[PDB]
Write an enzyme that holds these catalytic residues in place. Structure first.
Site, PDB file in Angstrom:
ATOM      1  N   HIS A 197     -74.176  15.366  46.171  1.00  0.00           N
ATOM      2  CA  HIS A 197     -74.039  16.817  46.346  1.00  0.00           C
ATOM      3  C   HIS A 197     -72.602  17.195  46.303  1.00  0.00           C
ATOM      4  O   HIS A 197     -71.831  16.738  47.146  1.00  0.00           O
ATOM      5  CB  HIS A 197     -74.625  17.275  47.672  1.00  0.00           C
ATOM      6  CG  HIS A 197     -74.401  18.751  47.970  1.00  0.00           C
ATOM      7  ND1 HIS A 197     -74.599  19.718  47.056  1.00  0.00           N
ATOM      8  CD2 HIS A 197     -74.009  19.395  49.140  1.00  0.00           C
ATOM      9  CE1 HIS A 197     -74.342  20.912  47.609  1.00  0.00           C
ATOM     10  NE2 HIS A 197     -73.978  20.711  48.884  1.00  0.00           N
ATOM     11  N   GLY A 198     -72.228  18.026  45.335  1.00  0.00           N
ATOM     12  CA  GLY A 198     -70.842  18.456  45.193  1.00  0.00           C
ATOM     13  C   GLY A 198     -70.650  19.884  45.648  1.00  0.00           C
ATOM     14  O   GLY A 198     -71.583  20.687  45.611  1.00  0.00           O
ATOM     15  N   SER A 199     -69.439  20.201  46.084  1.00  0.00           N
ATOM     16  CA  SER A 199     -69.109  21.560  46.472  1.00  0.00           C
ATOM     17  C   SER A 199     -67.601  21.727  46.474  1.00  0.00           C
ATOM     18  O   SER A 199     -66.868  20.740  46.490  1.00  0.00           O
ATOM     19  CB  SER A 199     -69.686  21.881  47.847  1.00  0.00           C
ATOM     20  OG  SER A 199     -69.302  23.171  48.273  1.00  0.00           O
ATOM     21  N   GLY A 214     -65.813  23.414  56.340  1.00  0.00           N
ATOM     22  CA  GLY A 214     -66.975  23.875  57.099  1.00  0.00           C
ATOM     23  C   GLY A 214     -68.206  22.989  56.967  1.00  0.00           C
ATOM     24  O   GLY A 214     -69.030  22.918  57.880  1.00  0.00           O
ATOM     25  N   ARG A 223     -75.678  23.618  54.949  1.00  0.00           N
ATOM     26  CA  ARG A 223     -76.419  24.805  55.364  1.00  0.00           C
ATOM     27  C   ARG A 223     -77.168  25.426  54.176  1.00  0.00           C
ATOM     28  O   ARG A 223     -76.827  25.197  53.025  1.00  0.00           O
ATOM     29  CB  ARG A 223     -75.453  25.823  55.982  1.00  0.00           C
ATOM     30  CG  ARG A 223     -74.628  25.274  57.143  1.00  0.00           C
ATOM     31  CD  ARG A 223     -73.445  26.167  57.519  1.00  0.00           C
ATOM     32  NE  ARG A 223     -72.633  26.556  56.365  1.00  0.00           N
ATOM     33  CZ  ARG A 223     -71.833  25.741  55.670  1.00  0.00           C
ATOM     34  NH1 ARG A 223     -71.707  24.453  55.988  1.00  0.00           N
ATOM     35  NH2 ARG A 223     -71.149  26.218  54.633  1.00  0.00           N
ATOM     36  N   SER A 252     -73.565  16.866  40.077  1.00  0.00           N
ATOM     37  CA  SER A 252     -73.051  17.329  41.364  1.00  0.00           C
ATOM     38  C   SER A 252     -71.548  17.505  41.328  1.00  0.00           C
ATOM     39  O   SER A 252     -71.037  18.396  41.984  1.00  0.00           O
ATOM     40  CB  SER A 252     -73.421  16.366  42.496  1.00  0.00           C
ATOM     41  OG  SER A 252     -74.734  16.606  42.965  1.00  0.00           O
ATOM     42  N   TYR A 262     -69.674  20.934  40.837  1.00  0.00           N
ATOM     43  CA  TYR A 262     -69.599  21.917  41.910  1.00  0.00           C
ATOM     44  C   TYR A 262     -68.318  21.741  42.719  1.00  0.00           C
ATOM     45  O   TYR A 262     -68.037  22.540  43.606  1.00  0.00           O
ATOM     46  CB  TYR A 262     -70.852  21.831  42.797  1.00  0.00           C
ATOM     47  CG  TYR A 262     -72.090  22.297  42.067  1.00  0.00           C
ATOM     48  CD1 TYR A 262     -72.644  23.543  42.311  1.00  0.00           C
ATOM     49  CD2 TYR A 262     -72.672  21.506  41.090  1.00  0.00           C
ATOM     50  CE1 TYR A 262     -73.760  23.977  41.619  1.00  0.00           C
ATOM     51  CE2 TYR A 262     -73.783  21.931  40.391  1.00  0.00           C
ATOM     52  CZ  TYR A 262     -74.325  23.165  40.657  1.00  0.00           C
ATOM     53  OH  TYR A 262     -75.436  23.569  39.949  1.00  0.00           O
ATOM     54  N   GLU A 311     -83.227  17.614  40.046  1.00  0.00           N
ATOM     55  CA  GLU A 311     -82.728  18.299  41.229  1.00  0.00           C
ATOM     56  C   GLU A 311     -83.615  17.931  42.410  1.00  0.00           C
ATOM     57  O   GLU A 311     -84.833  17.770  42.252  1.00  0.00           O
ATOM     58  CB  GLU A 311     -82.749  19.807  41.018  1.00  0.00           C
ATOM     59  CG  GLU A 311     -81.814  20.278  39.920  1.00  0.00           C
ATOM     60  CD  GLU A 311     -81.603  21.776  39.939  1.00  0.00           C
ATOM     61  OE1 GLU A 311     -82.607  22.526  39.973  1.00  0.00           O
ATOM     62  OE2 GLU A 311     -80.429  22.202  39.923  1.00  0.00           O
TER      63      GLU A 311
END
Ligand SMILES: [Zn+2]
Ligand SMILES: [Zn+2]
Lengths: 456, 136, 86
Positions: free
Chosen positions: A307-309, A316, A323, A349, A352, A433
């Site tokens: 999971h990338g962000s 956070g 979240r 991922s 992101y 996904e």
DNA sequence: GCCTACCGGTTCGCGAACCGGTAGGC
DNA sequence: GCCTACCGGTTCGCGAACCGGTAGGC
């Protein structure tokens, strides 16, 4: 808030409040058609009025001493109504034609890579620049905390606009929202007209903006606070605020070889714009994330997934875990509705992280995400409630990592096989996904740091 | 080019005919009526009273020659002639102005109150029933 | 909406951007609309109709480019139209 | 946006004038 | 018992001053 330094009297006399209501308001008014996109700050230090075009040297101000203090209230509450259209106290506010609308203001003992991690995820100026592309007002959004109830409305207006866009509603209806949104969240388009939110993805764009903007003020909330006593070190102060146990997996480690394999193996054939390079591996242990995940260690079909962000979000993501989108927020952009999304391929991922040729480093996660009894879907389908007995949704792609090479890890199935064809090809997804609709189902295991290598 | 150039030329006749018909009528009212009269003229005709001297007679002159403008279809505001069409100036919402626009707006006939001891002189300026002409 | 603007002086108060003398009331004057540095709005730069054509501006077709042209008096429209070409 | 010249509507200020009461003169 | 020159005070007339709301400028 505090005193506007355009007064030249900021560190002299305090801004005044009568018991509860603070004598200071920040107004705004936008007309997409006229192009007008304008501020109006009013204070009672003396009465101070500021005005101009948000995000530009266009405008002016008037500081003005009063004859007395009760004349301040008179002048203030008059100027206010003249400009806003309402009285200074009201049960619910109401906008008035061509009148303004008020915006609702509120020696370190650690490893060198871990210090760099705090360095990387708590540089807020980096996060600021991050915003500049969204055209959010850079000037006074750091010191001016935009309210929670406000931003929720900013979200709603977006979600309204998608709804309006989907069923080809009136230009008016749309216009009204575009006006409503930019008024409520000051943007900086310099000397050119605010653009209408008429697209499907323009909303998504502004949704993303809010998400990101929210996490910056969340990163500030962490950074500002604690107990400033001369004992611990600055980097340690911020580490303890992350409320997580981070460790450095050594490159010699046998488990570290697996991740690097997972990385090298599961890069997309179609995502050939860049090339990964694992600078680091961190083992990440959130405060009480194992107390809440115990329920799902009973659950079968557990998968270690990417999971990338954005690097700005990781300040956070550590302190609150992963979240789900708020309920007010639009569902545009999501394939199968609001919930944590995961990929089996590090590339997918990795996109992101939002890196470029000037900002090369990026962060990507690996979470034990208890999928359980999966709901399988081929085409995009915004789901509200899961079917019975299903604990997750899966988006079936063309390419899947080889299921006959699925290594295990601490009782977690790690699908680090290279891409082969899937069992069905009637899908509108190229890669898998994995979606969970409950923050408890995820348990973050590893945080990676990746350098990208492009060709330009 | 015979019928083309004729209707072409004979319209620019009728355009001037219109231009300085209203102008005659304007500075006729400037000679005879004070602003308050003209203000109460429009009000009687259920017309939004604009701000501005020039603009007040500009709407009284329009009012008399073509008609008392009926309110807007949706926003119920005041259409106003502006250069090449009648633009609505009302408010479809508090946040956004109304954008209605037409060359043929709806209107009832212009009703002068009884109080006019020189409305027989102004209306004696050979004025018959006619609609607004516009530029090409 | 338009860059330029023409009307009969609404008051003989505003002065002329080129020469700087008071543009007398009810006189034909021309404007070029600019951003005000002081507030979020366009503002007219009033020129004496005489002075307007020495600032180097050339409106090719006044009726489509200059605002208030249709509202002017007929013979005055022709002055602008002709003077537009020279 | 805010500043101010202009517009009409009223009050103010002051000098002529209008008036009634009167006390020295015949 | 008239007349009249002199004086204190109420009135009147008219321009100067004042003033709040606002169209026009920038
Ligand atoms: Zn309308
Ligand atoms: Zn001049």
């Amino acid at each position: 808030a505090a005193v506007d330094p355009d007064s030249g009297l900021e560190h002299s006399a305090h801004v005044l409040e009568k018991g509860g209501k603070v004598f200071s308001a920040t107004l705004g008014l936008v007309d997409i058609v006229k192009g007008t996109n304008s501020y109006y700050k009013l204070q009672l230090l003396w009465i101070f009025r500021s005005w101009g075009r948000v995000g530009t040297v266009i405008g002016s101000n008037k500081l003005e001493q009063m004859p007395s203090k009760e004349d301040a209230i008179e002048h203030f509450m008059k100027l206010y109504e003249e400009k806003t259209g309402n009285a200074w106290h009201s049960k619910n506010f109401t906008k008035y034609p061509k009148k303004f609308y008020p915006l609702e203001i509120d020696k370190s003992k650690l490893p060198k890579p871990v210090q760099d991690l705090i360095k990387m995820i708590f540089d807020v100026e980096s996060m600021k620049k991050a915003m500049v592309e969204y055209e959010i007002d850079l000037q006074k959004m750091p010191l001016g905390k935009l309210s929670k109830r406000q931003i929720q409305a900013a979200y709603s207006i977006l979600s309204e606009v998608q709804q309006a866009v989907s069923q080809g509603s009136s230009d008016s209806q749309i216009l009204d929202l575009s006006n409503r949104f930019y008024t409520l969240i000051p943007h900086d388009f310099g000397m050119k007209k605010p653009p209408l939110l008429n697209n499907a993805d323009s909303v998504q764009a502004k949704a993303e903006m809010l998400d990101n903007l929210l996490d910056i003020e969340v990163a500030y909330s962490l950074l500002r606070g604690g107990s400033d006593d001369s004992s611990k070190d600055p980097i340690d102060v911020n580490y303890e605020k992350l409320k997580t146990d981070i460790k450095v997996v050594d490159r010699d480690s046998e488990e570290a070889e697996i991740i690097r394999k997972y990385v090298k193996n599961t890069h997309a054939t179609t995502h050939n714009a860049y090339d990964l390079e694992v600078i680091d591996i961190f083992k990440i242990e959130r405060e009480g994330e194992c107390q809440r995940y115990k329920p799902f260690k009973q659950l079968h079909n557990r998968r270690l997934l990417w999971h990338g962000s954005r690097t700005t979000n990781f300040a956070g993501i550590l302190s609150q875990g992963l979240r789900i989108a708020p309920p007010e927020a639009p569902v545009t952009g999501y394939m199968f509705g609001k919930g944590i999304y995961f990929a089996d391929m590090v590339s997918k991922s990795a996109n992101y992280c939002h890196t470029s040729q000037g900002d090369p480093i990026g962060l990507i996660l690996l979470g034990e995400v208890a999928l359980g009894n999966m709901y399988e879907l081929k085409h995009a389908s915004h789901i509200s409630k899961l079917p019975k007995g299903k604990h997750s949704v899966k988006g079936l792609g063309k390419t899947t990592p080889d299921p006959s090479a699925n290594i295990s890890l601490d009782g977690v199935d790690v699908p680090l096989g290279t891409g082969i064809s899937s069992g069905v090809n009637d899908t509108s997804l190229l890669y898998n996904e994995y979606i969970v609709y409950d923050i408890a189902q995820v348990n973050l295991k590893y945080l990676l740091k990746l350098k990208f290598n492009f060709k330009t | 080019s015979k019928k083309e150039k004729d209707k072409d030329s004979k319209l620019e006749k009728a355009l001037k005919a219109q231009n300085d018909l209203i102008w005659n009528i304007k500075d006729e009212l400037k000679k005879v009526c004070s602003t308050n009269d003209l203000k109460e003229l429009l009000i009687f005709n259920k017309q939004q009273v604009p701000s501005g001297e020039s603009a007040i007679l500009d709407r009284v002159a329009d009012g008399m020659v073509f008609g008392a403008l009926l309110p807007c279809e949706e926003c119920s505001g005041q259409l106003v002639f502006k250069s090449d069409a009648y633009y609505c100036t009302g408010d479809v919402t508090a946040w956004t102005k109304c954008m209605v626009k037409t060359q043929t707006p709806n209107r009832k006939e212009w009703v002068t109150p009884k109080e006019f001891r020189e409305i027989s002189y102004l209306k004696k300026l050979k004025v018959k029933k006619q609609d607004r002409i516009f530029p090409p | 909406d338009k860059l330029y603007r023409v009307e009969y002086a609404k008051s003989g108060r505003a002065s002329c951007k080129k020469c700087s003398e008071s543009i007398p009331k009810d006189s034909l004057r021309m404007a070029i609309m600019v951003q005000s540095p002081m507030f979020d709005g366009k503002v007219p730069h009033w020129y004496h109709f005489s002075c307007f054509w020495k600032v180097g501006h050339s409106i090719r077709h006044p009726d489509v480019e200059v605002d208030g042209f249709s509202e002017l008096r007929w013979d005055d429209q022709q002055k602008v139209k002709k003077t537009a070409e020279a």
